Design a protein around this ligand. Sequence first.
Ligand SMILES: [Zn+2]
Lengths: 55, 116, 216, 111, 48, 168, 82, 52, 37, 65
Amino acid sequence: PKRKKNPMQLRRKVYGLHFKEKYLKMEEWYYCPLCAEPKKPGEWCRREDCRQIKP
Amino acid sequence: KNSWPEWMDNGADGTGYGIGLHRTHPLSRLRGNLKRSPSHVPRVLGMMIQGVWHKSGVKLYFRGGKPPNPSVHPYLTGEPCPLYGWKVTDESVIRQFNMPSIDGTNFRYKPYVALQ
Amino acid sequence: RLELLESMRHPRERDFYQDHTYHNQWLRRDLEKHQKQQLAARYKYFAPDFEISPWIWYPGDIVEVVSGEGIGQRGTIIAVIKYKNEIVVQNINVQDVVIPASESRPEQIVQREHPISVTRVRHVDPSTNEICNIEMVKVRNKETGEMEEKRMSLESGILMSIPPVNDELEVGDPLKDTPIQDADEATYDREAEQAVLVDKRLEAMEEHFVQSLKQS
Amino acid sequence: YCERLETELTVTQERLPQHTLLMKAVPSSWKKLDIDISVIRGLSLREAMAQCKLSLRKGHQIVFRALEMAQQGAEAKGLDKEHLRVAHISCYPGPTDKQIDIRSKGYYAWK
Amino acid sequence: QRKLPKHFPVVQASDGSSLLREETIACMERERRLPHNMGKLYSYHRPY
Amino acid sequence: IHKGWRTWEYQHTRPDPRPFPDPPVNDYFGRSRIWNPIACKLGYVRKKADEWGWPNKPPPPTGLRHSQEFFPFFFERYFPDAEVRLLLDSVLNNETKRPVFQIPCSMSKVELVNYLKNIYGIDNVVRVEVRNRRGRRYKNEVGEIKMMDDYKVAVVELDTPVSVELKQ
Amino acid sequence: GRFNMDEAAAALQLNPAYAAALYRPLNYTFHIRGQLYPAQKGRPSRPGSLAASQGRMFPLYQRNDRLDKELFRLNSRGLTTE
Amino acid sequence: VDREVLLTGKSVWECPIHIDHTCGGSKTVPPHAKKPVRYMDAGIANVGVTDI
Amino acid sequence: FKQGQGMFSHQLKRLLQKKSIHRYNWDPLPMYDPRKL
Amino acid sequence: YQRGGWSPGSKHQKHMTLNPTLYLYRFPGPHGPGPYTMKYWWTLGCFPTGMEVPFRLHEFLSTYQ
RNA sequence: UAAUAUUUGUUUAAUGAAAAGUAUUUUAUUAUUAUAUUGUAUAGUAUUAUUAUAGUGUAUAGUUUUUUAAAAAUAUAAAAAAUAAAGUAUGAAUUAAUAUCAAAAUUUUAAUAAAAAUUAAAAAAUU
Ligand SMILES: [Zn+2]
């Protein structure tokens, strides 16, 4: 760095899509019909119902 | 030279039996190497911090982590001889605790005095 | 809250020196200054001469509260805490005392009188019922030349006696205690034992003197 | 007059249908925690707890603890669990500890 | 007029004899080390 | 003194030496604490107040001072001072042949046996083992470092196993 | 029908307290310098807790001087020329 | 003692602890010490004055 | 050794500061011994 | 050398031969001392540097008294 | 600067250790053949540093804390091969007169001229 960056340069990084995708992003989920925990589709739990039929 | 006898500088035998600090009851004729004079002040500290490294591979006096007080050692009561490991040259320095008992009204006495 | 403080952090971050310390903690080095100030402000009675000179207030006296809360209230002195310069006055400055729970008991909220500073209370003249400035007087006690000290009200000239210090007489340990008729028996015959002592000092003094004569 | 002012301020803050939890000395930074907070503003308690539960970030874990405890507080206050919402989430700078980072040629700095 | 500064301790008998003053001092000192009265310590560094 | 300093502008007072001396008192209450061999005036003067009144009373003849009857020796012979105390956890409800004593560090193995023989009447003692343990150091709630007195741990080996029973 | 170091020492006449001392470091038996962990050192009693000493929490790692005097340092009566 | 007095209500006359105001420095002073007699001191206190 | 972080060298910087007993031993006269005159 | 304060809390680079300081592991900061040093306060009995004299009077009055 | 560098604990032949001058052993501990007395565990170099210095004495105690799902270029070894970069967590340092910035060209002005004037045509983020 050759100079102190003002609040605008600090604020410029949040307009970027990289920032938004990394930090402020909401996850999509449903309720596991076997466990009733919030769940992302494609990720399962160690429980013998959830291994064979993985809901 | 040294007032204190030479067996407490280097040992009475080869393994350095009798060396260290020795304190004397100051009613007793025999004398120790504990001297608080300025000129002696290095070597007493030299015993308390270092101790001494004997050529026999064993470190005499203080080898550890707890430095010994030369001041509260019990009094020097004798001198070492090779036959019987310690000769008692002076018995009068050992405290003989003696308590008078069952004399007069002494039995009725109790450690505390009562109230009125 | 400590365990959830450690349940919210990451396992990756180590913190060293858990049971030992780089610097030796057994040196006496002073506190940081504001807790020294806490100590001083909390502990004022450790100062020299904090006890007030010829102390007047003794339990049983009737006293007005001059300043602060409860101003203008007359009461009787219940207890004296002398080294703090504090007074407990009957049903003045009564607050709650919390007695915590334990194995057998619940938490109890119990009203109690709390110590008042001596600065803000003044005596009431037992005759005039006015605030009197009390001075401290010596008066020959009856049958006694000791002239023990009483407190006089300057306006009306009334002497107030000092009450006794009566205490727990409920403490005793008969088996282990010597009775008085036992303890007061005189065994000291002094001349005989004095002679013995003196002679055995004499012996040593002479002995060393003749040793001096020898080496001279 | 004054004690009455503070009385009515406390009672107008109290008889309001909300629960305000203040958690102090949270073990995260200001910037990171602000980042992790800004996701959750203006959400249901349901989606708040779910979005806190479903992320890999420290800030979200901390906010989950806060949500759970404030929820217990609000239920102890007599509100309804199913209608709760995060009305206000904010972070402000707290306390600090310092550390020695040792660097070559007799250089040091304070982490 | 004082014969010792106000902040000095009073170590002496009630008669004023200084005969025992070293015993009194020694006693006070061993007592400042470990007061006989002393209740439970709230410190994490505890003698046992 | 190629060039003389201006010394006329100073009033005469001794500056403090910049490598300032630390106070002679020993602040370390740990394990490694050293007894200071150096003797100040105060030691001898307090001796002199203790043994005879030095400020007021006239000194006794040397022959008395150097004799068994001289008061600190007299009082030590006829009024001994030792705290020989017992760790109860050694003698509590277990039978133990080896009770453990705390002892003032100036006692020998012989003096303990003499103590137990003539006072407590403990007549069977096979032998004594001796440790010197530095007194117990603790901090109180203000953080004042305090150190209880140094002691000597004596494991005392008997003939007959000894217990002290606790009624539950 | 396992190993059982005690009955292995009894079969070999190895003094079963010693045989075990072969399989722990020389720090834990003999008086010898060695790496010690400050959590083993022991702790004074807190208000919440009791005292913690290395007598109760580590009996088997403490030093034995039977073995130490019989193995390492010399006997005096072997050398006495008197 | 504060707690116990607050509960039991007993009056306490002498302080339950001894305070060495010299913080262990009075032992440094030699045992025979006494202040010298100072003559004609500066002060207004030896004139007992109640009203000024 | 007085230079170290150890506590022995910490004591020696402090303990060695106190002043020893002083008496004025005024010189002996070995060759003129007044007591034999 | 010395691009920051002469304090032992200050931000930037220091040097040992100019600004000598001893080794303070976790030095409680300018304001509040935080949850880390307090973690140490509630577990090992004092702050990790051993310079901060443990002073608990204020809780002795709270629990034991 | 800095959503940065660093750190990152999934498998041990560090066998040994007097020369360390710091580390609450609550009683670490003989049963001795010997006599009294004294003393045994981790802090060298500002660090729990690259990793110690040296004198013992010995050879089968495996004697038991190193993250990770592409490719360039850097570092080793044989442009192939081995290693490392989106990562969750920790979080420094050089630097900092600045306004949301200063892109391209032309001449001028007291010495590059990011100084002028004129024409002009520089979006945001990340590497
Ligand atoms: Zn499931």
